[PDB]
Design a protein around this ligand. Sequence first.
Ligand SMILES: CCCCCCCCCCCCO[C@@H]1O[C@H](CO)[C@@H](O[C@H]2O[C@H](CO)[C@@H](O)[C@H](O)[C@H]2O)[C@H](O)[C@H]1O
Ligand SMILES: CCCCCCCCCCCCO[C@@H]1O[C@H](CO)[C@@H](O[C@H]2O[C@H](CO)[C@@H](O)[C@H](O)[C@H]2O)[C@H](O)[C@H]1O
Ligand SMILES: CCCCCCCCCCCCO[C@@H]1O[C@H](CO)[C@@H](O[C@H]2O[C@H](CO)[C@@H](O)[C@H](O)[C@H]2O)[C@H](O)[C@H]1O
Ligand SMILES: CCCCCCCCCCCCO[C@@H]1O[C@H](CO)[C@@H](O[C@H]2O[C@H](CO)[C@@H](O)[C@H](O)[C@H]2O)[C@H](O)[C@H]1O
Ligand SMILES: CCCCCCCCCCCCO[C@@H]1O[C@H](CO)[C@@H](O[C@H]2O[C@H](CO)[C@@H](O)[C@H](O)[C@H]2O)[C@H](O)[C@H]1O
Ligand SMILES: *C(=O)CCCCCCCCCCCCC
Lengths: 79, 171, 84, 126, 67, 56, 12, 155, 120, 104, 170, 459
Amino acid sequence: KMELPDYKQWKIEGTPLETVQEKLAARGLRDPWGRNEAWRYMGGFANNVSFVGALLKGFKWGFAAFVVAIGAEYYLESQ
Amino acid sequence: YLTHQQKVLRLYKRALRHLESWCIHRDKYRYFACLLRARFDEHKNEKDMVKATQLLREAEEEFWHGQHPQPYIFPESPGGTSYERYECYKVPEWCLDDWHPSEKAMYPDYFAKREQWKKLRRESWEREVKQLQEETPVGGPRTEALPPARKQGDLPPLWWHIVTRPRERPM
Amino acid sequence: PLTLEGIKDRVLYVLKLYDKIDPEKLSVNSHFMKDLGLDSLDQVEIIMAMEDEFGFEIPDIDAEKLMCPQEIVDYIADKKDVYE
Amino acid sequence: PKYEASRLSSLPTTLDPAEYDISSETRKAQAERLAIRSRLKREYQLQYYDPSRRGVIEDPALVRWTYARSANIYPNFRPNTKTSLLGALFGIGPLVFWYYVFKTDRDRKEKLIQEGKLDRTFNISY
Amino acid sequence: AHIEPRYRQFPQLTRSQVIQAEFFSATMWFWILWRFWHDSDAVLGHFPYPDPSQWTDEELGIPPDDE
Amino acid sequence: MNMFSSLSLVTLLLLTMPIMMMSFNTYKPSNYPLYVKTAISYAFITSMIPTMMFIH
Amino acid sequence: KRLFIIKPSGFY
Amino acid sequence: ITKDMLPGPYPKTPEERAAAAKKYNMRVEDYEPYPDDGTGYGDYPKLPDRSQQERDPWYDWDHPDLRLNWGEPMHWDLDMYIRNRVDTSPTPVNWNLMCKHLFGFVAFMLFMFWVGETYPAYQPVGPKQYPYNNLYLERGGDPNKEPEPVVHYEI
Amino acid sequence: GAHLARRYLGDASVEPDPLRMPTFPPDYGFPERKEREMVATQQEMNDAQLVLQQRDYCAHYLIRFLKCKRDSFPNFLACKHERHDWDYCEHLDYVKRMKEFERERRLLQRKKRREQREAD
Amino acid sequence: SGYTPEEKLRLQQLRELRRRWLKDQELSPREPVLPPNVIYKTYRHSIFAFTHVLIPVWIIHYYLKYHVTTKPYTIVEKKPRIFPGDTILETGEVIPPMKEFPDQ
Amino acid sequence: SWDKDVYPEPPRRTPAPSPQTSLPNPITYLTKAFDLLVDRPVTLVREFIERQHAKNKYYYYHREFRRVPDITECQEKDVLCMFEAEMQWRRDYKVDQEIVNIIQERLKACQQREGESHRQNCAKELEQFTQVVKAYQDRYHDLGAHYSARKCLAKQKQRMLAERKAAKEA
Amino acid sequence: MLKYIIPTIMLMPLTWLSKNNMIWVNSTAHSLLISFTSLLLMNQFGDNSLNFSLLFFSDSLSTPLLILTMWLLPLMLMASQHHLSKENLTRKKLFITMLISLQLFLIMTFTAMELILFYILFEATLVPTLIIITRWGNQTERLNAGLYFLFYTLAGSLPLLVALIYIQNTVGSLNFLMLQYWVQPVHNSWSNVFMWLACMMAFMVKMPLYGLHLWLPKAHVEAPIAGSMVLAAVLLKLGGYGMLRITLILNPMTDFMAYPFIMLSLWGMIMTSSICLRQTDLKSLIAYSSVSHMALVIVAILIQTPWSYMGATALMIAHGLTSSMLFCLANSNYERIHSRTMILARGLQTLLPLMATWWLLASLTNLALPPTINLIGELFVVMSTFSWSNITIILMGVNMVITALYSLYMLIMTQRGKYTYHINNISPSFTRENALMSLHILPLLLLTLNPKIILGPLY
Ligand SMILES: CCCCCCCCCCCCO[C@@H]1O[C@H](CO)[C@@H](O[C@H]2O[C@H](CO)[C@@H](O)[C@H](O)[C@H]2O)[C@H](O)[C@H]1O
Ligand SMILES: CCCCCCCCCCCCO[C@@H]1O[C@H](CO)[C@@H](O[C@H]2O[C@H](CO)[C@@H](O)[C@H](O)[C@H]2O)[C@H](O)[C@H]1O
Ligand SMILES: CCCCCCCCCCCCO[C@@H]1O[C@H](CO)[C@@H](O[C@H]2O[C@H](CO)[C@@H](O)[C@H](O)[C@H]2O)[C@H](O)[C@H]1O
Ligand SMILES: CCCCCCCCCCCCO[C@@H]1O[C@H](CO)[C@@H](O[C@H]2O[C@H](CO)[C@@H](O)[C@H](O)[C@H]2O)[C@H](O)[C@H]1O
Ligand SMILES: CCCCCCCCCCCCO[C@@H]1O[C@H](CO)[C@@H](O[C@H]2O[C@H](CO)[C@@H](O)[C@H](O)[C@H]2O)[C@H](O)[C@H]1O
Ligand SMILES: *C(=O)CCCCCCCCCCCCC
């Protein structure tokens, strides 16, 4: 009915879970549930914007339309 | 009424949940969940029970000091935001006996099957009572545990209100 | 909309992502203590992982009795009115 | 910093010194407490699950509670120093307090009206 | 349904929701920029605030100490 | 005046109509929520007319 | 599938 | 219910205490009546003054909403301790400390509002000036009288 | 703020009292001081139904703005020039109130400085 | 900590019954046995406007015109603002303009 | 419909449309639509109803009460005279309540009509309200729930006694 | 009044000569017809009351009380016929005869011209009421409730008889129209203080005044449903009607004699409102709610202002429908679970949806939601007591808060939460019960459209 993605693909390498495993390794400890969290750091969840990037969503096209809108205004006031 | 082991394991689970409430981020929680497991592991083999009780006693005082004043609660757990939310939709099964005949006529097949469940309940009651009588000590039951059906063709005593209870999402 | 097999698949999925369990020696009937060599602190963590997986709490009185994957599946199927 | 219990904030069980002094006498007491609860639970369940029962399972505990909260009070009342002082202070005291508050207020208002110093310019509804 | 749930993966998205969200985010930024181009006084100050310490004693009618 | 006052009262009266229909006169529970939602949207339009006259 | 909804009688 | 199964007077003798405990379905060691002042408690048990919120929510209570079992003795103030009313649950902060901080915060704010009232902020301007003798007629002044002129000069 | 520190922390005897100013005669140091002119008549502001707080020495600009707003409906983006004129008149009115505060402040300072002459 | 054999058996037996009960809540195909584009979007909106705007506004206007406004002070309007330079419809009066402003 | 002297209204001064925009006024077209869709059909229905009323003209009357001797002319305990004087006083009391209500309605109408200039422009109405409330208070205030002509007369005589005393000593 | 007295009397032969199975149909149908004709009493004049004869008169105070009285008889018959089903025929007809006789005494009581005639019918109401409580109540405590009810009433009423006979000797008449004109002021003396007390205490006990109210929670908890309805709806208002009339001849002594009773009432209403928050018996809670509401009426009557007398009249009528409706609501639960304990049956909204709606509407009128006539009456008393003394707003406002809390506590406890698991005999609401609730609430809310008819003579 539902197909679960293959479980072997969930690896902690390349994620901040790897950093934690190294901090715990220094002390002699190990994190046995790391792979159970890996999915949160992979795939479409891998890169998320910073807070400034969130506020600036749509700024590129808003700014583009602004320049055209004011460029047209200067053109009209020129005539 | 809880053994020493039960108390220690309940403290471990409770402390991990409050720890997760403080950490929030999964990687951070994994780091401190391992450090916390190490502390419980450092005294796992303590044998002098007087010493172990003192450790548990002190650990509960440390937990009280460091608990989250607003820990995460699963939504449907007691005190959660969805706790008891659907109780207003849970209607007991006996209400169906009072339906008007024209209401029952809308579900002929459901009510035929319901009539078989009531027949099963009626035919089984006297054996259920008898089994409880002959399995209960003279003074009375000393725990709330109930037995299973012994003979084939018997039903576990006092089953109706467990089996026919409302669904968790009744609508 | 859970099913009996969907619950089993996810219960075993979580256990296969636990480093203390050999994913090949894991069956629905494995006893966490007699068959897998875990202890009672490991058992608490397994139960906590199941609560996170399915998003609901298993009280300590009930949790302490679930000692194999199949019992976890049976417990979850019972609380969620899953009959298929 | 130790927990300080109050009337409206009980002492947590995990911090109770007696929750760890579970002796053979206390374990015996707990078993007896569970025995009563199980005995009552069985009595209730035999009626609750009875397929031929339609009605209300009367609870003597509930009957005793509502009876204790009304009918049983006067028979066990004794007029002594305690009940007389509370009766006098709480029953008579407020009536005297409010009599003087209103009597004083009304005497003042009446005196002002009788001297034309209370402003009733537009007061024609009473 | 038209959007099927996924297990441990980023959800399925539609074009309509992505484009509509972007258009309204861009409209917010166009509007702020357009409004600030014409109405910066509403943010920075409509009128100059004078320096009272630089008014002469003549215009304030302050007589000299010997009067 | 007559349009301003009439429309301001029709806004309020429009909002009560779905309540009165719950007296089963002309009642179609098929989509009561859509009926109520539509009544609000129409009331919003009728309330803008006297608002415009006040602004003017 | 569709499940019967236990309600009190609404006829009366 | 027979009269022997209803609350009675305060128990005087140990046999009465053992009988009262039985009637209330309690251990004679757990049974303790209210003090025998003239307040009318009789032999009704004195139970712990705890809210029903404090009871285990995972136990299979006969009355889950009340967290009561059938036949167990009800607290005298049960109706005050239902989960909709008085909660006695333990708090993360001590009750006494909680009162000090709430009262202290309120007292500080009230003090500072008196201070800010005695030393108001304002701008360095003179009064607003109005024409026509400070709008004497518009403010309702009597037309038949004459206000002292209010004159405003340029600056 | 600056003025508030001087009065509340510094010497309050040489700072204006906002609730009692002016305290010097309007012609003190001001030979032949003209009167403020009022362009709008009382009857004009009565028919315009100006809010009483709006019936000040800038009311003629407010009346002109209000008329434009009505006449330009539904174009609610017109009358910006008229709005600015009323706003500007109010700005000058405010600056005049700022000068009154500064005039009083300097006179109070002069008085104290003079009352040191009469005892030094 | 684990189910006793007797607890395991009872849970297994109750589990069978509960699942049979839940399966019995499913409706059969015939249940319930009930006793006996753009243009169509204009119609509903057209009939709705007629029965919920036009008819109510006919009733209100009739009520206001011929009952409410035939009684004193039932509908009282703030009198219109009159600005300098206006013309009165009732009389033809012309309000004079304001004085000449100083330049600013 | 109603007497304008009893319920006065100042003459209405509406400005003429003086647009300074090229955009059409949405209200003007809406005004025209309202007169066509709402006013005209409503007027036709009323005109039909007025036709039926014109066929069946009949009259009702405002009851007139002759004056009878008031309580001051009644002998003590003479219930037959006191009864007619008391009934007349009760009727006059109800009338005076409505006189105050008319004056209050005038005052409230003026306040709304005059807008922001109401404080200056409703002085005459506020004066008349002030005077009538004073007269009504003198007649009827403080009589109690069991009021009567006898108690009202007692109140007046007390007031006349005070006014005589003040006048004499002055 | 003969057009009402005689048809009321005819209900007795009607009930006794009916076929065995038609006693409820016939008595209910014709008592409803009598109620219909009662609307003819609305012919009231601005100045004069409606003075039929030397015995009977009706004014704006007695008219709404009459219409409430004649409306309640059919409602009482509907409410009673279920719990009386197993009673033998002759004893049913006797029960209906007591209800008819109570209506006969009541309509004559509210229209009697002469105060001594009023006294006799005022006192005759005790007999059928006492019989109804002690013969047809269910519990042992009904015998004690009858005695408390009887002797509390007679303790105050016998002094009233002496005072009234003394007044007739001194004045020469007890005719109320005569007293309006021959009344003389009451001077300060110890003789007049006790004359004042004898004239008022009988009515205070019936209201009941706080401190003399202990009989009332007994009488309700023990009375059958019809006894509770007329006790709450009408019989309490005998006291209010009595004071509204007799205070005419007690001025100006009421200026200061009222103080002890205003204090008892102002404080009493808060005490009895607080008591409702901890009541375990649903019928006892509703009974204590009546004490709190009638405390306002006592205050309103005692301060004697046009606004307070109008509020007192509206309050008496509004409380009559609300309180009687609440008893009927509580009784409908009692007929299923056979217990008055409030906490026994919970979550009933899940099981009886439409009945829960009647519970909500009765609660909202009890807490005086505007613009119900419950609120109109209470507000008018609040307005007039504020003029009496501004500080009363503190007590009146606090009582409004407490009234909401117990009104909704009763609603939440019984209707909401989870249903009791073992109570499995909650059968669907009968048509009879639903019709009974609507015949309370519908006229109550319809009166909001025309409040003047229940505002009394001072309107
Ligand atoms: C008077 C003018 C009023 C304002 C008018 C403003 C008009 C602006 C229209 C913007 C339409 C943009 O449309 C949307 O843009 C974003 C830009 O990141 C694209 O998004 C693109 O970058 C993001 C990451 O940064 C990812 O989703 C992906 O790499 C790509 O899709 C969308 O695929 C496209 O659908
Ligand atoms: C922008 C916000 C503007 C408003 C800011 C308001 C801040 C004012 C805070 C006032 C409250 C201070 O209240 C004060 O807290 C401290 C900290 O525990 C208490 O301190 C005391 O209790 C603690 C803990 O029991 C112990 O260390 C010791 O007994 C003592 O230090 C004081 O007994 C209490 O009086
Ligand atoms: C000279 C003065 C004498 C005055 C006498 C005036 C009344 C005379 C009445 C005579 C008839 C009495 O009628 C006798 O009693 C009752 C009432 O009708 C009848 O039987 C009754 O049964 C039930 C009540 O139990 C009812 O349906 C109904 O009241 C009637 O049918 C008897 O079958 C009849 O025999
Ligand atoms: C709320 C509804 C109540 C329903 C009550 C049902 C019972 C109805 C009883 C009807 C009684 C009618 O009683 C009779 O009516 C007729 C009208 O034809 C009146 O007839 C008279 O009325 C007036 C009297 O001033 C005159 O116009 C004229 O003398 C004559 O028309 C009689 O004076 C009256 O005796
Ligand atoms: C719930 C309980 C309610 C209790 C209410 C108690 C009210 C008490 C009212 C006190 C006023 C009684 O009435 C008052 O009695 C005194 C006597 O003492 C009378 O006094 C009379 O005889 C004395 C002689 O001693 C003369 O001096 C005096 O001139 C004369 O008036 C007054 O005429 C009267 O004003
Ligand atoms: C100068 O133009 C005035 C601007 C107002 C500044 C506000 C200063 C806030 C200081 C805190 C208040 C403390 C109470 C005395």
